[PDB]
Amino acid sequence: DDDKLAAAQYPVVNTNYGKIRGLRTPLPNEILGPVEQYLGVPYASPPTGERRFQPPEPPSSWTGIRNTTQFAAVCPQHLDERSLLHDMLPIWFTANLDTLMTYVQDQNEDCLYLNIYVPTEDDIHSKKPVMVYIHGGSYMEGTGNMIDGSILASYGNVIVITINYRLGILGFLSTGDQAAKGNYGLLDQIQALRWIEENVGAFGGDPKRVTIFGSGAGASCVSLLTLSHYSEGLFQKAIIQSGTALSSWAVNYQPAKYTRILADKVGCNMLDTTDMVECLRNKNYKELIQQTITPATYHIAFGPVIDGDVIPDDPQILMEQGEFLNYDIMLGVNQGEGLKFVDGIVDNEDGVTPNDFDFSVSNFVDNLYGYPEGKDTLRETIKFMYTDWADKENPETRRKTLVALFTDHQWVAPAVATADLHAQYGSPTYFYAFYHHCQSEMKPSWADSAHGDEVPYVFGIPMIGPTELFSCNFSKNDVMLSAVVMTYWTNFAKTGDPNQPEEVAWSRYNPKDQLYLHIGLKPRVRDHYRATKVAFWLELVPHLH
Amino acid sequence: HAGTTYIFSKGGGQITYKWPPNDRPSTRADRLAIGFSTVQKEAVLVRVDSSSGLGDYLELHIHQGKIGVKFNVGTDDIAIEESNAIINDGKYHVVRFTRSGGNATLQVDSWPVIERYPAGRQLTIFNSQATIIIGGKEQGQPFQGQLSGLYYNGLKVLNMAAENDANIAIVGNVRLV
Ligand SMILES: [Ca+2]
């Protein structure tokens, strides 16, 4: 409010931690305004030297102005071109990867930073809502910086915020006791929200209208957050896309042993916890990550522990009955999340063969349900359930059934409880099954919408001449869908009803009816998404032992 | 009574809040405060009932002439009464309330802070707080005295009972002093 032009070219927003000077930028699209950008802003104090493996304390303070105009480095991550967590990342990553790494190089442990996108338009019909994005993967990778919010930010006139949070070995290491309780990542996340809660007002924001939303493995955090002593107050509505806190790879039940594999494999042999944690602390943002620690097929090595506090009991037991507050929750899973499940076993004809179908079910019952040694029944049941007795032979049908298992058993089936349990206790619960996807190379021609295909439609990339990451040939429809998507996502964040603030009626999910939304090219509302098959996994299965 | 006063009477005489169905908080901690004066043997004084399908509830009740709380947030029913007191006489008392999960804390006007800590392992949260039934008429056992100056999680129940704001529902033998 003095140097009119030059000071409105890149603004100057008073935080409680100083003044930050940001950056105004327009967008390429025709019907899309500019958006103020405050890239690389700090929400905590560098988890440095001492702090490492300890929860995050506030950021510091300056005077004058601070140039917040470029994404700061991200956390400890090393990505073995393969020998990563392959099977549960998002398709647009497990390949493409190559130059999806303009955000790899430039890694400093001093990493806790967030980005702010604010819409320029004057709403003089009131303070705009907010949307904090927890980015996924399998923990131990990634950044908020690879997804640009501005497109969403602008379209819905809502503030969008990507964050960076501690990662993997730096961010989730647990002895399982005292010297390193665990869950450091979702805790910076928590501080990100408590920073936001405090400051977002001074940009243009309404801390009573904060919505946290994630990409699946990031949705993990967002679902896990519903359940914390710590979360209450910092957000109101959550959108939980493509998975939950019950996925086999949501919660780490034995960081006991997987810290012992790394301890021994770093000259840190001491057999007393508090002695050992001071060892790893005095190693390096290096070394410790360059270690290959293999989790057990379909688990994680470094991830959220049930410590006793931040995560107080088993997500299943917490959800199972009480203990979350009341979150206005919108969750849903994509059609063929699994896909990566049928790797290699699909011929260049286009299907999977029977005595390859069987070895898959039996390297499923074998992997996931180890120990029961009943199983076999399970196995011959599992594979009875997932064969089409109309087209008993037809090997394309047998390919689809396979991915459809995994898909059911890792996202849909769990995402229907959670969706069931939230309706059960007060929360309004809106639900969606994502069917459409942008189709390109990397992702075969037959793949239905696989895990993580939901993203670019939620962030509006079809209003922009594609990208690395999202190298797909976009149509006019993809645009028209993203429009319907971002309006449903936005309106939800603005109110508690994707509909309300030229389309179809969504309507709330609620175990009597079970209405879901069928987000495809024409959205129609259906009911009981996969009932028979979800009821399989969540009923006659734990019926054993 | 040193606030927006309200009387209570013979026959049928009970009030009903109704939270807006999409808006049913559920907290870790509840903070009730309300100062009364009765003359009745058995009764129900107040009650938040959650919703349907939910046995979570919180019920101050005039059993034996001892205004005493009884509540289930999840597992078993907790209950903090002060079972020594013939206080149901017509006299006025300012009976406050604290809760953090299973841990709770009652305190009549100035006497001691009688508090329970069920050792089992209680559940932390109420669920779907919907309707606040001050009167005990719909419980089966009614109450005949009064209340005033109400406070509840920072939501003034009986300043808003006289404003006639949207959500209140007053059907009983009752007054305002
Ligand atoms: Ca409960």
Side-chain angles (χ1 to χ4, degrees), chain A residues 226-232 312-313 321-328 424-426 428 430 496 508, chain B residues 21-28 51-54 56 73-75 121-128:
Chain A
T226 39
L227 315 185
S228 193
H229 179 244
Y230 284 43
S231 276
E232 75 155 308
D313 195 325
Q321 27 134 14
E323 318 214 313
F324 38 102
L325 299 312
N326 59 114
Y327 295 101
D328 237 322
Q424 187 102 74
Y425 302 101
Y430 283 88
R508 323 216 281 84
Chain B
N22 257 47
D23 307 323
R24 324 233 210 205
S26 326
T27 326
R28 273 181 185 79
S51 59
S52 293
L54 275 178
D56 302 34
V73 278
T75 26
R121 165 257 201 72
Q122 260 288 1
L123 315 192
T124 57
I125 49 53
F126 217 158
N127 301 76
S128 195

Side-chain angles (χ1 to χ4, degrees), chain B residues 5-67:
Chain B
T5 311
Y6 259 86
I7 236 175
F8 268 91
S9 297
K10 261 198 161 203
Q14 163 252 338
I15 210 176
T16 276
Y17 204 92
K18 184 170 50 271
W19 261 294
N22 257 47
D23 307 323
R24 324 233 210 205
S26 326
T27 326
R28 273 181 185 79
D30 279 296
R31 209 92 46 259
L32 188 41
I34 203 177
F36 82 105
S37 30
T38 196
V39 298
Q40 199 194 13
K41 282 281 162 59
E42 298 293 300
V44 161
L45 201 291
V46 161
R47 204 182 159 96
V48 283
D49 324 325
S50 72
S51 59
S52 293
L54 275 178
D56 302 34
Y57 76 86
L58 180 61
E59 186 217 53
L60 177 59
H61 83 308
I62 305 84
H63 174 73
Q64 305 267 176
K66 281 87 84 169
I67 276 63

Side-chain angles (χ1 to χ4, degrees), chain B residues 106-126:
Chain B
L106 207 66
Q107 197 261 112
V108 187
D109 210 293
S110 193
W111 315 358
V113 177
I114 256 76
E115 53 191 67
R116 196 166 139 191
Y117 289 67
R121 165 257 201 72
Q122 260 288 1
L123 315 192
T124 57
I125 49 53
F126 217 158

Side-chain angles (χ1 to χ4, degrees), chain A residues 207-221:
Chain A
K208 293 256 299 319
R209 286 205 273 167
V210 179
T211 299
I212 65 183
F213 68 126
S215 153
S220 317
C221 311

